Amino acid sequence: NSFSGYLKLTDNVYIKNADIVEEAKKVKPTVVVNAANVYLKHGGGVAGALNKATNNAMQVESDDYIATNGPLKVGGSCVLSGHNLAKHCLHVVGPNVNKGEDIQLLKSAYENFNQHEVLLAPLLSAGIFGADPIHSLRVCVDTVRTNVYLAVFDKNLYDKLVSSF
Ligand SMILES: Nc1ncnc2c1ncn2[C@@H]1O[C@H](COP(=O)(O)OP(=O)(O)OC[C@H]2O[C@@H](O)[C@H](O)[C@@H]2O)[C@@H](O)[C@H]1O
């Protein structure tokens, strides 16, 4: 967990303008967080970038998990292998606001972070799921008490997050 280049937002929340995949390769963290859907079908955001960097090992593992356990609940999580990127991957499902799911479930989603002392993580629901990224950062800051290192790839979004925080 050797995190460098992060801006301190609060006592336990840090942020960097970086690709979460490149951070995982540099830091080799204990836990990397995936912004997942309930079926762990890894799509066009963080999930697909993580999966591609595991040369699809993550998706094969995820498919087997889902065949046994069924879908996650919105706001829920599961711990699977981090493969070559981390010791563990915490797959967390934020609400899909674009499909009408309750934004209030973003609190429950971030509560999953508290089971791990330190995490490399993205802003949940703030991309393909359509939540306000500024709001997602606020919920993270208010909800997570363990040490979270947030990686935000889009510099325009990063600058707006830091400015309004
Ligand atoms: N490689 C990346 N590194 C860092 N941040 C990233 C990266 N790619 C996207 N982001 C940012 O991470 C945040 C989360 O975006 P998404 O990954 O799209 O996550 P979410 O909004 O929760 O959507 C989940 C959905 O997207 C699919 O990838 C996934 O399978 C699920 O269906 C957003 O702020 C987005 O700009």
Burial of 57 (0-12, 13-18, 19+ CB in 10 A): middle
Experiment type: X-ray
d(CA 126, CA 122): 9
Helix 20-27 to helix 46-53 angle, to the nearest 10 degrees?
40
Does the beta carbon of 75 lie inside 6 Å of ligand 1?
no
d(CA 130, CA 104): 13
Q: Strand 31-35 and strand 7-8: pairing?
A: unpaired
Question: CATH number of the domain that 102 lies in?
Answer: 3.40.220.10
Range of the domain at 104: 1-165
Does the beta carbon of 127 lie inside 6 Å of ligand 1?
yes
d(CA 103, CA 122): 17
Residue pair 149/120 in contact by the 8 Å Cβ criterion: yes
Mutate to test the pocket of ligand 1, among 91, 128, 155, 158 (most ligand atoms within 8 A of CB): 128
Does the beta carbon of 122 lie inside 6 Å of ligand 1?
yes
Length of the chain, in residues: 165
Number of domains, the chain:
1
d(CA 10, CA 39): 33
d(CA 136, CA 147): 16
Contacts of 92 (CB under 8 A, 6+ apart): 33, 34, 35, 36, 76, 77, 109, 110, 112, 113, 124
The neighbour count for residue 122, using CB atoms within 10 Å, is: 25
Resolution in A: 1.5
Q: Distance from the CA of 12 to the center of ligand 1, in angstroms? A: 22
